[PDB]
Amino acid sequence: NNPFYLRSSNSFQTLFENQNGRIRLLQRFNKRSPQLENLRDYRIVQFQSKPNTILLPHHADADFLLFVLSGRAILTLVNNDDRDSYNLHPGDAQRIPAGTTYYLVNPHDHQNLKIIKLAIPVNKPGRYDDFFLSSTQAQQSYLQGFSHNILETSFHSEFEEINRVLLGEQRQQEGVIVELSKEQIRQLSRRAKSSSRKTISSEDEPFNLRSRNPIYSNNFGKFFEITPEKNPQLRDLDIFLSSVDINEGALLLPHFNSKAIVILVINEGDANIELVGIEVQRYRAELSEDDVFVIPAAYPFVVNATSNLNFLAFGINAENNQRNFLAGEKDNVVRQIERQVQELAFPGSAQDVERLLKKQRESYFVDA
Amino acid sequence: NNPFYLRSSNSFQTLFENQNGRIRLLQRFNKRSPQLENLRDYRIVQFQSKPNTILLPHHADADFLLFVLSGRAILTLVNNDDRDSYNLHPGDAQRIPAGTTYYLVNPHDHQNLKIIKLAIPVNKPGRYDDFFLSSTQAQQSYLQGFSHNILETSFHSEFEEINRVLLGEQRQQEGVIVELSKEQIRQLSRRAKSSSRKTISSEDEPFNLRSRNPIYSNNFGKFFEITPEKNPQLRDLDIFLSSVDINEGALLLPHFNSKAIVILVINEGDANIELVGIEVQRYRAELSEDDVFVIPAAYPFVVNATSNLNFLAFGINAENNQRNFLAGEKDNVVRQIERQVQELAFPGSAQDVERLLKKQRESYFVDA
Amino acid sequence: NNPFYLRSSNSFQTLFENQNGRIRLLQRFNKRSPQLENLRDYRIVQFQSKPNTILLPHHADADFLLFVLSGRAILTLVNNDDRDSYNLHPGDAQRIPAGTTYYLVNPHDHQNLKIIKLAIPVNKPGRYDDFFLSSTQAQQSYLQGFSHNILETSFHSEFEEINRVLLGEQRQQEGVIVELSKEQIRQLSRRAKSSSRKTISSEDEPFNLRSRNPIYSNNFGKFFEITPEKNPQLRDLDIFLSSVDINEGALLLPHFNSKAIVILVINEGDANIELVGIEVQRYRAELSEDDVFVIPAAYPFVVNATSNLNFLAFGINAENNQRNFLAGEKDNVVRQIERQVQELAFPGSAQDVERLLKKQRESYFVDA
């Protein structure tokens, strides 16, 4: 019973699912246990869709920070007078302001589209609703919420017309993810602007973690990260994003984040995490794809890859976060203690400590 | 019965009242429905007073954003070394910072003074107290909480003297709102600064809503709005103000605010409102003068004026809010949706959708 | 039963205590009484250690605003690639960011080190844990929370040696505050930056409150105060500091803060305090060394020193706070009400109210 571990097979609630894909909402971080209370305004959403599909137009009373784990997506946000459309590849991230109507195409022919969105609801901490403009066997259009008179007046048309064309009270679709012809992807994709090296510090276009060099990278791992200091959209959310690769049989060395609260999601592969909290308490879990683990701020932890692994991290409370390592040569806080203090904090000579800590000649990732 | 509707006769508690005026406090938004949790920091206050009256000096442990619905006022904020007096007219808005001693005159001879303020308590979320300096048959001066010995040392006088002059333990007024002579309004007014075109973006002086052009206006209504982007006091509170007129028998077309939570207050007239939440849920209400209605962020709604109508609205969480209309020609999000997506999202041809969405030819306000 | 008085003897919990000093954590501000709910993210920590001692390296999931009440300290913050020592004197303040490893030396040979820190926990509002790197008879190292296998791989070493050097499962020390030699204090002191007049507005270094002229000073009292206006560290936190000396038999005149919530801490001496809330409510307490008292924003209060007195104040919600006195010549709000409104608000003529407010020729501090 590890409250910071959310196994994908029992921590989600399906919101919409059919033959074309699925939208699952993670359980609230706080309802499991009160140690995660300052995550109460955040939810994780998972979106997955079959090739040649579109998620129909809708908005939500929540900001979404979306990140493409794998596949390809056309994300099109439709404003009251304009339309922004973006071509997303793995590693691409983009903020969707609360209450923006958008739709989401998977234009690939064989690859499934895998998206995670950090949701930030506006009206009530941690709970929001999807408002679907469309009419569909799964859900009613929100335009159906207005009376016959009000609708007739607003559309300057008889109710029969507006019901036949918009609502369908057979003629309507089956779900909120539906299939596309080739011709329509051919037209829906061809206005979509793609992320670039020149977008890493843009205020509107999508940006990509992996388009820049890792902060740490050796023969055993790669750690990509983008922080509020570099991106104004992450600056506004006070969030950082990381995407880290670990070879099978290697680990990310024990470390902790000074002030950021980390939500990590397994994208591919499996891994063993150990987490330390306060006499000390060991928190352990064995993870697989779609699993979620949360590292409270300043709690040390380690990630031991048991297969080839990638995970995404969301860093809440991100501003001026420091990643402090407890082993290895680079970024090792323990080795920065004055020698006389090392002497008194541990049982052992200064030189006996100094020698023990110099042994691991590598940094960040090592072989296991 | 609609948790977002707050009928004026059932939703206000009277804080003070007598023959000269009255002050009432709206109920906590998050008590009425735990659906309005992110409004818990805010309260609505309604102030009304007769001609040639004054609300005596006091302060509160809340920020106020006050707005003059109708009538005329002199607002005087007293500082520890200074004093600022303002000449206020219908549409005039001003922030009173938390803990600022002030008093408030109705200088008019025949017109009642009607004011609404948005309260933002400091010590407890959504709860604050008024601290009256005056000693009055309806509340004790907060000077009276100090003991006799501390009073005498503080003021360097016998308690008899300070009691006689400050407290009167008859010689004191009957309530906190009391009548004024003509001579005194004469004296109290001749240093009051008035709002003006150049005050539209001050941090000091009152700014008037309806002194710029309306952002939408046609033959059926007018929509005045000032946002954080134009006025620095509104930027600090992160609030927008609107004032909107609607001719009897017209309506504000269905629309939603992308991210702003709106508290609206009926200033004059009668209206029916329809609000759509989530299968859809219809929330409907018939409103009149002094009633309040709350629209959560990204919930669509309509407002149908059954008599000539003016309402005031406060937008919580206002920065970069977008107003998205669902019908009419201008700022219509539905009509920004790509055509092939309209075909897949509604049960009807692409031309069938385009043809209906053009039928309504007006924007914003239409005749019912 | 004053819900704003936090008597030392029954409002603290001992976190650590041994022969060389002790750390204590004040009870939650809100668990006391629902009146202080907007202080639920804050906690007070009292620190005290004997001469020639050191607090062993640790970090916490909280920001600390620490303040030296009396004595001398070397504060060393160790970063992942750097180290920063500071030489602290009474009045010195420094923010220790969350998750910053640090150790705290008392280099004095006779005087104790009295420190208070304002904690702002990161993961759960108002609740944090200390993460000691050291393996001591009083607490396990958090490195012990990782498994045998993991620790071997990370430190490239057999578990016997890791255990034999860092953990020691007799060789280790008794508590988290331990004694120091004179060789060691020599060495830990010779790079220790010391606050001065060019750090008053640093974003990094200690700044001394008492190195500037006080804001109020006369023959009875001294009132030093530094605010977020002039120091970026306090600006990020939205906190002011004050330290005020009052001679025995003198008193701080009745006053309120407009918008700041004040946590005061008796450093040295005894005082009677009258607090006034809302008919009016009298709140009284006899304070002495280490007591804590909260003054909600906009509540008038008075400090009557019954022995030579110094206290420290944290002003939460500090930006643009105004201090309004209610007696004396300078910064007296009551003396700024127009004559005619003084005529209406008190049962005494304007001439009688004029004479009585003028009678206290002194300001801020006066003699009892």
PDB file of N, CA and C in Angstrom, chain A residues 35 37-38 254 256 258-259 261 274 276 278-280 282 296-302 323-324 326-327 331-333 336 338 340-341 344-347 352 356 359-360 367, chain C residues 40 57 59 61 78-80 82-83 98-99 103 122-125 130-131 133-135 140-142 145-147 150 153-155 161 164-166 171 173 180 184 187-188:
ATOM      1  N   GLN A  35      -0.903  13.123   2.151  1.00  0.00           N
ATOM      2  CA  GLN A  35       0.456  13.601   1.922  1.00  0.00           C
ATOM      3  C   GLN A  35       0.595  14.356   0.602  1.00  0.00           C
ATOM      4  N   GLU A  37      -1.570  16.693  -0.624  1.00  0.00           N
ATOM      5  CA  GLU A  37      -2.644  17.684  -0.649  1.00  0.00           C
ATOM      6  C   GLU A  37      -2.330  18.823  -1.611  1.00  0.00           C
ATOM      7  N   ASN A  38      -1.074  19.237  -1.698  1.00  0.00           N
ATOM      8  CA  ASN A  38      -0.818  20.359  -2.591  1.00  0.00           C
ATOM      9  C   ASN A  38      -0.734  19.956  -4.055  1.00  0.00           C
ATOM     10  N   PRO A 254      20.358   7.865  -7.018  1.00  0.00           N
ATOM     11  CA  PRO A 254      19.543   8.491  -5.965  1.00  0.00           C
ATOM     12  C   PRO A 254      19.731  10.004  -5.922  1.00  0.00           C
ATOM     13  N   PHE A 256      17.185  14.010  -5.315  1.00  0.00           N
ATOM     14  CA  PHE A 256      15.899  14.591  -4.977  1.00  0.00           C
ATOM     15  C   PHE A 256      15.834  15.998  -5.538  1.00  0.00           C
ATOM     16  N   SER A 258      14.705  19.821  -4.991  1.00  0.00           N
ATOM     17  CA  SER A 258      14.659  20.665  -3.801  1.00  0.00           C
ATOM     18  C   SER A 258      13.225  21.075  -3.462  1.00  0.00           C
ATOM     19  N   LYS A 259      12.487  21.610  -4.437  1.00  0.00           N
ATOM     20  CA  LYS A 259      11.151  22.151  -4.156  1.00  0.00           C
ATOM     21  C   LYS A 259      10.040  21.677  -5.091  1.00  0.00           C
ATOM     22  N   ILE A 261       7.422  19.184  -6.994  1.00  0.00           N
ATOM     23  CA  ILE A 261       6.659  17.964  -6.766  1.00  0.00           C
ATOM     24  C   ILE A 261       6.487  17.278  -8.116  1.00  0.00           C
ATOM     25  N   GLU A 274      12.323   3.165  -5.734  1.00  0.00           N
ATOM     26  CA  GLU A 274      12.349   3.294  -4.286  1.00  0.00           C
ATOM     27  C   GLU A 274      12.247   4.769  -3.931  1.00  0.00           C
ATOM     28  N   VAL A 276      12.090   7.438  -0.424  1.00  0.00           N
ATOM     29  CA  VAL A 276      12.360   7.572   0.999  1.00  0.00           C
ATOM     30  C   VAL A 276      11.562   8.734   1.572  1.00  0.00           C
ATOM     31  N   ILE A 278      10.144  10.225   5.753  1.00  0.00           N
ATOM     32  CA  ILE A 278      10.356  10.072   7.184  1.00  0.00           C
ATOM     33  C   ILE A 278       9.186   9.327   7.813  1.00  0.00           C
ATOM     34  N   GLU A 279      13.896   7.655  12.376  1.00  0.00           N
ATOM     35  CA  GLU A 279      13.444   6.497  11.610  1.00  0.00           C
ATOM     36  C   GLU A 279      12.863   6.834  10.222  1.00  0.00           C
ATOM     37  N   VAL A 280      13.314   6.090   9.217  1.00  0.00           N
ATOM     38  CA  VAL A 280      13.033   6.369   7.813  1.00  0.00           C
ATOM     39  C   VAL A 280      12.038   5.352   7.255  1.00  0.00           C
ATOM     40  N   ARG A 282      10.663   3.343   3.762  1.00  0.00           N
ATOM     41  CA  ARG A 282      10.921   2.947   2.377  1.00  0.00           C
ATOM     42  C   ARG A 282       9.609   2.740   1.627  1.00  0.00           C
ATOM     43  N   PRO A 296       6.966  13.345  -3.810  1.00  0.00           N
ATOM     44  CA  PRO A 296       6.888  14.598  -3.056  1.00  0.00           C
ATOM     45  C   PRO A 296       8.207  15.356  -3.128  1.00  0.00           C
ATOM     46  N   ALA A 297       8.104  16.679  -3.026  1.00  0.00           N
ATOM     47  CA  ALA A 297       9.262  17.559  -3.046  1.00  0.00           C
ATOM     48  C   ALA A 297      10.240  17.223  -1.929  1.00  0.00           C
ATOM     49  N   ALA A 298      11.523  17.199  -2.286  1.00  0.00           N
ATOM     50  CA  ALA A 298      12.655  16.935  -1.399  1.00  0.00           C
ATOM     51  C   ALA A 298      12.728  15.499  -0.882  1.00  0.00           C
ATOM     52  N   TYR A 299      11.896  14.571  -1.401  1.00  0.00           N
ATOM     53  CA  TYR A 299      11.986  13.143  -1.050  1.00  0.00           C
ATOM     54  C   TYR A 299      12.976  12.436  -1.968  1.00  0.00           C
ATOM     55  N   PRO A 300      14.019  11.796  -1.442  1.00  0.00           N
ATOM     56  CA  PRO A 300      14.988  11.115  -2.317  1.00  0.00           C
ATOM     57  C   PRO A 300      14.368   9.890  -2.981  1.00  0.00           C
ATOM     58  N   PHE A 301      14.803   9.606  -4.208  1.00  0.00           N
ATOM     59  CA  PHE A 301      14.302   8.415  -4.879  1.00  0.00           C
ATOM     60  C   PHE A 301      15.278   7.946  -5.946  1.00  0.00           C
ATOM     61  N   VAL A 302      15.008   6.748  -6.458  1.00  0.00           N
ATOM     62  CA  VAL A 302      15.825   6.146  -7.497  1.00  0.00           C
ATOM     63  C   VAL A 302      14.926   5.386  -8.466  1.00  0.00           C
ATOM     64  N   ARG A 323      18.035  19.836  -8.697  1.00  0.00           N
ATOM     65  CA  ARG A 323      18.148  18.383  -8.583  1.00  0.00           C
ATOM     66  C   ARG A 323      19.483  18.042  -7.929  1.00  0.00           C
ATOM     67  N   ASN A 324      19.422  17.467  -6.734  1.00  0.00           N
ATOM     68  CA  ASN A 324      20.583  17.216  -5.886  1.00  0.00           C
ATOM     69  C   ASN A 324      20.839  15.714  -5.841  1.00  0.00           C
ATOM     70  N   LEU A 326      22.923  12.208  -4.665  1.00  0.00           N
ATOM     71  CA  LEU A 326      23.520  11.685  -3.448  1.00  0.00           C
ATOM     72  C   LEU A 326      24.602  10.654  -3.717  1.00  0.00           C
ATOM     73  N   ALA A 327      24.958  10.440  -4.976  1.00  0.00           N
ATOM     74  CA  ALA A 327      25.970   9.478  -5.376  1.00  0.00           C
ATOM     75  C   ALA A 327      26.535   9.958  -6.697  1.00  0.00           C
ATOM     76  N   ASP A 331      27.149  16.817  -9.407  1.00  0.00           N
ATOM     77  CA  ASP A 331      25.936  17.325  -8.751  1.00  0.00           C
ATOM     78  C   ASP A 331      25.639  16.625  -7.420  1.00  0.00           C
ATOM     79  N   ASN A 332      26.687  16.167  -6.739  1.00  0.00           N
ATOM     80  CA  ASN A 332      26.569  15.338  -5.540  1.00  0.00           C
ATOM     81  C   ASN A 332      26.626  16.240  -4.305  1.00  0.00           C
ATOM     82  N   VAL A 333      25.463  16.508  -3.696  1.00  0.00           N
ATOM     83  CA  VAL A 333      25.424  17.416  -2.546  1.00  0.00           C
ATOM     84  C   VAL A 333      26.251  16.868  -1.395  1.00  0.00           C
ATOM     85  N   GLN A 336      29.715  17.896  -1.187  1.00  0.00           N
ATOM     86  CA  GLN A 336      29.930  19.318  -0.969  1.00  0.00           C
ATOM     87  C   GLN A 336      29.913  19.723   0.504  1.00  0.00           C
ATOM     88  N   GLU A 338      31.602  20.245   3.975  1.00  0.00           N
ATOM     89  CA  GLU A 338      32.965  20.427   4.476  1.00  0.00           C
ATOM     90  C   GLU A 338      33.479  19.160   5.158  1.00  0.00           C
ATOM     91  N   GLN A 340      35.295  18.512   7.754  1.00  0.00           N
ATOM     92  CA  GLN A 340      35.119  18.376   9.195  1.00  0.00           C
ATOM     93  C   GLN A 340      33.681  18.035   9.553  1.00  0.00           C
ATOM     94  N   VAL A 341      32.719  18.466   8.733  1.00  0.00           N
ATOM     95  CA  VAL A 341      31.318  18.163   9.012  1.00  0.00           C
ATOM     96  C   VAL A 341      30.988  16.739   8.583  1.00  0.00           C
ATOM     97  N   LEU A 344      31.859  14.545  11.481  1.00  0.00           N
ATOM     98  CA  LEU A 344      30.954  14.456  12.627  1.00  0.00           C
ATOM     99  C   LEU A 344      29.588  13.889  12.275  1.00  0.00           C
ATOM    100  N   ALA A 345      29.145  14.056  11.029  1.00  0.00           N
ATOM    101  CA  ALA A 345      27.820  13.584  10.647  1.00  0.00           C
ATOM    102  C   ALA A 345      27.780  12.068  10.512  1.00  0.00           C
ATOM    103  N   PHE A 346      28.891  11.447  10.128  1.00  0.00           N
ATOM    104  CA  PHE A 346      28.969  10.003   9.993  1.00  0.00           C
ATOM    105  C   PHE A 346      29.988   9.418  10.961  1.00  0.00           C
ATOM    106  N   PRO A 347      29.826   8.153  11.327  1.00  0.00           N
ATOM    107  CA  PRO A 347      30.920   7.419  11.988  1.00  0.00           C
ATOM    108  C   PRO A 347      31.972   6.991  10.980  1.00  0.00           C
ATOM    109  N   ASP A 352      37.986   8.555   5.385  1.00  0.00           N
ATOM    110  CA  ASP A 352      37.185   7.354   5.177  1.00  0.00           C
ATOM    111  C   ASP A 352      35.866   7.674   4.476  1.00  0.00           C
ATOM    112  N   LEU A 356      35.150   6.759   0.413  1.00  0.00           N
ATOM    113  CA  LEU A 356      33.931   6.021   0.080  1.00  0.00           C
ATOM    114  C   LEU A 356      33.120   6.730  -1.000  1.00  0.00           C
ATOM    115  N   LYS A 359      34.345   6.708  -4.876  1.00  0.00           N
ATOM    116  CA  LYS A 359      34.437   5.426  -5.566  1.00  0.00           C
ATOM    117  C   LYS A 359      33.592   5.418  -6.830  1.00  0.00           C
ATOM    118  N   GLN A 360      32.332   5.843  -6.733  1.00  0.00           N
ATOM    119  CA  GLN A 360      31.478   5.922  -7.917  1.00  0.00           C
ATOM    120  C   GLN A 360      32.004   7.033  -8.823  1.00  0.00           C
ATOM    121  N   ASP A 367      25.525   1.663 -14.553  1.00  0.00           N
ATOM    122  CA  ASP A 367      25.121   0.303 -14.872  1.00  0.00           C
ATOM    123  C   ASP A 367      24.764  -0.452 -13.599  1.00  0.00           C
TER     124      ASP A 367
ATOM    125  N   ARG C  40      -2.451  28.893   7.706  1.00  0.00           N
ATOM    126  CA  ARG C  40      -2.292  27.437   7.738  1.00  0.00           C
ATOM    127  C   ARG C  40      -1.074  26.937   6.957  1.00  0.00           C
ATOM    128  N   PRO C  57      24.133  18.203   8.978  1.00  0.00           N
ATOM    129  CA  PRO C  57      23.547  18.525   7.666  1.00  0.00           C
ATOM    130  C   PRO C  57      22.199  17.851   7.460  1.00  0.00           C
ATOM    131  N   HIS C  59      18.044  18.796   5.345  1.00  0.00           N
ATOM    132  CA  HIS C  59      17.223  19.647   4.505  1.00  0.00           C
ATOM    133  C   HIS C  59      15.777  19.376   4.882  1.00  0.00           C
ATOM    134  N   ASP C  61      11.415  19.792   3.374  1.00  0.00           N
ATOM    135  CA  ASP C  61      10.472  20.165   2.326  1.00  0.00           C
ATOM    136  C   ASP C  61       9.673  21.391   2.775  1.00  0.00           C
ATOM    137  N   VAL C  78      24.896  24.144   1.489  1.00  0.00           N
ATOM    138  CA  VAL C  78      25.626  23.350   0.513  1.00  0.00           C
ATOM    139  C   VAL C  78      24.688  23.039  -0.645  1.00  0.00           C
ATOM    140  N   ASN C  79      25.112  23.413  -1.846  1.00  0.00           N
ATOM    141  CA  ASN C  79      24.394  23.142  -3.079  1.00  0.00           C
ATOM    142  C   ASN C  79      25.017  21.925  -3.753  1.00  0.00           C
ATOM    143  N   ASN C  80      24.424  21.506  -4.873  1.00  0.00           N
ATOM    144  CA  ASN C  80      24.913  20.306  -5.543  1.00  0.00           C
ATOM    145  C   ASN C  80      26.310  20.484  -6.123  1.00  0.00           C
ATOM    146  N   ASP C  82      28.294  23.622  -5.057  1.00  0.00           N
ATOM    147  CA  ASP C  82      28.802  24.843  -4.452  1.00  0.00           C
ATOM    148  C   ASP C  82      28.523  24.792  -2.960  1.00  0.00           C
ATOM    149  N   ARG C  83      29.123  25.732  -2.236  1.00  0.00           N
ATOM    150  CA  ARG C  83      28.907  25.885  -0.807  1.00  0.00           C
ATOM    151  C   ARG C  83      28.916  27.370  -0.471  1.00  0.00           C
ATOM    152  N   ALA C  98      13.606  25.755   0.023  1.00  0.00           N
ATOM    153  CA  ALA C  98      13.183  24.399   0.362  1.00  0.00           C
ATOM    154  C   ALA C  98      14.106  23.357  -0.257  1.00  0.00           C
ATOM    155  N   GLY C  99      14.399  22.308   0.502  1.00  0.00           N
ATOM    156  CA  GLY C  99      15.256  21.264  -0.018  1.00  0.00           C
ATOM    157  C   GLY C  99      16.699  21.685  -0.177  1.00  0.00           C
ATOM    158  N   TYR C 103      23.919  23.271   7.411  1.00  0.00           N
ATOM    159  CA  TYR C 103      24.264  23.050   8.811  1.00  0.00           C
ATOM    160  C   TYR C 103      24.505  24.387   9.523  1.00  0.00           C
ATOM    161  N   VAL C 122       6.095  22.582   1.669  1.00  0.00           N
ATOM    162  CA  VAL C 122       5.892  22.515   0.226  1.00  0.00           C
ATOM    163  C   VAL C 122       4.863  21.456  -0.175  1.00  0.00           C
ATOM    164  N   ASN C 123       4.851  20.274   0.461  1.00  0.00           N
ATOM    165  CA  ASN C 123       3.998  19.180  -0.013  1.00  0.00           C
ATOM    166  C   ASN C 123       2.605  19.162   0.616  1.00  0.00           C
ATOM    167  N   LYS C 124       2.512  19.411   1.921  1.00  0.00           N
ATOM    168  CA  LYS C 124       1.237  19.501   2.621  1.00  0.00           C
ATOM    169  C   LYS C 124       1.192  20.846   3.332  1.00  0.00           C
ATOM    170  N   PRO C 125       0.091  21.591   3.267  1.00  0.00           N
ATOM    171  CA  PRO C 125       0.087  22.925   3.899  1.00  0.00           C
ATOM    172  C   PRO C 125       0.352  22.837   5.399  1.00  0.00           C
ATOM    173  N   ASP C 130      11.992  16.961   8.479  1.00  0.00           N
ATOM    174  CA  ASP C 130      13.427  17.170   8.322  1.00  0.00           C
ATOM    175  C   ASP C 130      14.082  15.887   7.829  1.00  0.00           C
ATOM    176  N   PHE C 131      14.990  16.038   6.875  1.00  0.00           N
ATOM    177  CA  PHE C 131      15.689  14.934   6.225  1.00  0.00           C
ATOM    178  C   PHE C 131      17.164  15.082   6.591  1.00  0.00           C
ATOM    179  N   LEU C 133      20.899  13.990   6.734  1.00  0.00           N
ATOM    180  CA  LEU C 133      21.825  13.129   5.997  1.00  0.00           C
ATOM    181  C   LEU C 133      22.638  12.236   6.928  1.00  0.00           C
ATOM    182  N   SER C 134      22.680  12.564   8.208  1.00  0.00           N
ATOM    183  CA  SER C 134      23.573  11.928   9.164  1.00  0.00           C
ATOM    184  C   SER C 134      22.936  10.686   9.761  1.00  0.00           C
ATOM    185  N   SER C 135      23.776   9.737  10.125  1.00  0.00           N
ATOM    186  CA  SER C 135      23.345   8.569  10.878  1.00  0.00           C
ATOM    187  C   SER C 135      23.737   8.804  12.328  1.00  0.00           C
ATOM    188  N   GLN C 140      17.905   7.970  11.887  1.00  0.00           N
ATOM    189  CA  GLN C 140      18.549   7.307  10.764  1.00  0.00           C
ATOM    190  C   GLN C 140      18.824   8.290   9.637  1.00  0.00           C
ATOM    191  N   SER C 141      19.896   8.027   8.891  1.00  0.00           N
ATOM    192  CA  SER C 141      20.125   8.751   7.650  1.00  0.00           C
ATOM    193  C   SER C 141      19.047   8.360   6.646  1.00  0.00           C
ATOM    194  N   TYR C 142      18.609   9.320   5.829  1.00  0.00           N
ATOM    195  CA  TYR C 142      17.647   8.918   4.810  1.00  0.00           C
ATOM    196  C   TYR C 142      18.289   8.060   3.725  1.00  0.00           C
ATOM    197  N   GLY C 145      17.249   4.484   3.703  1.00  0.00           N
ATOM    198  CA  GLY C 145      15.978   4.086   3.143  1.00  0.00           C
ATOM    199  C   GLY C 145      16.060   3.416   1.798  1.00  0.00           C
ATOM    200  N   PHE C 146      17.247   3.297   1.232  1.00  0.00           N
ATOM    201  CA  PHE C 146      17.423   2.567  -0.007  1.00  0.00           C
ATOM    202  C   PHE C 146      17.933   1.166   0.308  1.00  0.00           C
ATOM    203  N   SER C 147      17.631   0.236  -0.593  1.00  0.00           N
ATOM    204  CA  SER C 147      17.874  -1.175  -0.353  1.00  0.00           C
ATOM    205  C   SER C 147      19.348  -1.496  -0.549  1.00  0.00           C
ATOM    206  N   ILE C 150      20.487  -1.514  -4.282  1.00  0.00           N
ATOM    207  CA  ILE C 150      20.553  -0.157  -4.836  1.00  0.00           C
ATOM    208  C   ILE C 150      21.764   0.608  -4.295  1.00  0.00           C
ATOM    209  N   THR C 153      25.064  -0.498  -5.930  1.00  0.00           N
ATOM    210  CA  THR C 153      25.247  -0.005  -7.294  1.00  0.00           C
ATOM    211  C   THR C 153      25.553   1.488  -7.309  1.00  0.00           C
ATOM    212  N   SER C 154      24.820   2.279  -6.513  1.00  0.00           N
ATOM    213  CA  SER C 154      24.992   3.730  -6.563  1.00  0.00           C
ATOM    214  C   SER C 154      26.367   4.150  -6.051  1.00  0.00           C
ATOM    215  N   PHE C 155      26.808   3.589  -4.933  1.00  0.00           N
ATOM    216  CA  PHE C 155      28.087   3.989  -4.359  1.00  0.00           C
ATOM    217  C   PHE C 155      29.256   3.149  -4.851  1.00  0.00           C
ATOM    218  N   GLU C 161      30.994  -1.888   3.752  1.00  0.00           N
ATOM    219  CA  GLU C 161      31.752  -0.646   3.818  1.00  0.00           C
ATOM    220  C   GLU C 161      30.833   0.575   3.856  1.00  0.00           C
ATOM    221  N   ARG C 164      29.531   0.559   7.102  1.00  0.00           N
ATOM    222  CA  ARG C 164      30.603   0.799   8.050  1.00  0.00           C
ATOM    223  C   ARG C 164      31.067   2.252   8.050  1.00  0.00           C
ATOM    224  N   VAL C 165      30.721   3.050   7.042  1.00  0.00           N
ATOM    225  CA  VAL C 165      31.195   4.420   6.932  1.00  0.00           C
ATOM    226  C   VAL C 165      30.068   5.410   7.192  1.00  0.00           C
ATOM    227  N   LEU C 166      28.941   5.243   6.500  1.00  0.00           N
ATOM    228  CA  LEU C 166      27.866   6.223   6.555  1.00  0.00           C
ATOM    229  C   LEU C 166      26.859   5.891   7.642  1.00  0.00           C
ATOM    230  N   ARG C 171      29.979   4.011  17.198  1.00  0.00           N
ATOM    231  CA  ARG C 171      30.778   4.811  16.282  1.00  0.00           C
ATOM    232  C   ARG C 171      30.056   6.110  15.932  1.00  0.00           C
ATOM    233  N   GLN C 173      27.199   9.378  16.517  1.00  0.00           N
ATOM    234  CA  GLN C 173      26.972  10.432  17.494  1.00  0.00           C
ATOM    235  C   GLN C 173      25.562  10.343  18.091  1.00  0.00           C
ATOM    236  N   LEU C 180      31.562  20.602  19.118  1.00  0.00           N
ATOM    237  CA  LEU C 180      32.584  20.949  18.143  1.00  0.00           C
ATOM    238  C   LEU C 180      33.882  21.308  18.845  1.00  0.00           C
ATOM    239  N   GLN C 184      38.037  22.761  14.576  1.00  0.00           N
ATOM    240  CA  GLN C 184      36.982  22.632  13.573  1.00  0.00           C
ATOM    241  C   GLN C 184      36.243  23.948  13.367  1.00  0.00           C
ATOM    242  N   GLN C 187      38.254  26.202  11.234  1.00  0.00           N
ATOM    243  CA  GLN C 187      38.235  25.896   9.804  1.00  0.00           C
ATOM    244  C   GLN C 187      36.886  26.225   9.157  1.00  0.00           C
ATOM    245  N   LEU C 188      35.772  25.936   9.835  1.00  0.00           N
ATOM    246  CA  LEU C 188      34.472  26.193   9.224  1.00  0.00           C
ATOM    247  C   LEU C 188      34.126  27.677   9.144  1.00  0.00           C
TER     248      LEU C 188
END
